[PDB]
C-alpha cells in the first residue's frame, strides 16, 4: 500500500507540474525581473538626459568641443546614474538570491 | 560600399559603426531606418541604391588571463570572452 501510494503521489506531482501554468513562479519571476532590469538599463541609453540628442555620435559631430564637453557631461551624469541604480538593484537582488 | 567587414559608416550623417551584411528582412518601401526592442539602429537602407543593409556591432568582449601563481610559473592563457576566434588576431 505504501509503495502504491508513493508511486501515485509521484505521478500526481508530475501531472500537477505539467498542468499548472504558474507552477514555476519563483524562477520565472526571477528571470523576468532580471530581464526587465536589463531592458530598462538598455532603454536608458535612448533618454535625452537634457542634452541636444541621445546619440553620442550625433553630439560629437555637429558640435564644437567647448559645448560638446558640457553636452557629454550631461550624458555622462545621466548614464552613470542609471548604471549605478541598476548595479544597486542587482546587488539587492543578488543578496535575496 | 564594403560588406562583411567592420567598417565605420556615415549614412548622410548617421556616423555609426558596425558590420554591414545582406539583410534577409524586407523593409517596407516608405521605411528607411530600422530598430529593435532596444531601438538600436539594426538596419539602414542605402542612399543611392534600394538595398537593405543589416548592421551588427563590431565584436567586443572582455579578456581574461588564466594564470597559475607567479611564484609557480609566468605562463598564462588568455580567454577572449564571447567571441569566435576566427577573427581574434585583428
Amino acid at each position: 500500500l505504501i509503495a502504491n501510494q508513493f508511486n501515485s503521489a509521484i505521478g500526481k506531482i508530475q501531472d500537477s507540474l505539467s498542468s499548472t501554468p504558474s507552477a514555476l513562479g519563483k524562477l520565472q519571476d526571477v528571470v523576468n525581473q532580471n530581464a526587465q532590469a536589463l531592458n530598462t538599463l538598455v532603454k536608458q541609453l535612448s533618454s535625452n538626459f537634457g542634452a541636444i540628442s541621445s546619440v553620442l555620435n550625433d553630439i560629437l559631430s555637429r558640435l564644437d568641443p567647448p559645448e560638446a564637453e558640457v553636452q557629454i557631461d550631461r550624458l555622462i551624469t545621466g548614464r552613470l546614474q542609471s548604471l549605478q541604480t541598476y548595479v544597486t538593484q542587482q546587488l539587492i537582488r543578488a543578496a535575496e538570491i | 560600399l564594403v560588406k562583411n567587414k567592420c567598417v565605420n559608416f556615415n549614412f548622410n550623417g548617421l556616423t555609426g559603426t558596425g558590420v554591414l551584411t545582406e539583410s534577409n528582412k524586407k523593409f517596407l518601401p516608405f521605411q528607411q531606418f530600422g530598430r529593435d526592442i532596444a531601438d538600436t539602429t539594426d538596419a539602414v537602407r542605402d542612399p543611392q541604391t534600394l538595398e537593405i543593409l543589416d548592421i551588427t556591432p563590431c565584436s567586443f568582449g572582455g579578456v581574461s588571463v588564466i594564470t597559475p601563481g607567479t611564484n609557480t610559473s609566468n605562463q598564462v592563457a588568455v580567454l577572449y570572452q564571447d567571441v569566435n576566434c576566427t577573427e581574434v588576431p585583428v
Binding site: 528571470v31 536589463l38 | 532596444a38 538600436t40 568582449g61 570572452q81
Partner: peptide, 22 residues
Amino acid sequence: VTKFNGLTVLPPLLTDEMIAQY
C-alpha cells in the same frame, strides 16, 4: 521555465548537464 550595448552574459560554471549529474 521560459543586441549588444556593452552587455555580455557569462555562462555558468556548472552546466545544466552537470547539475543534473549532481
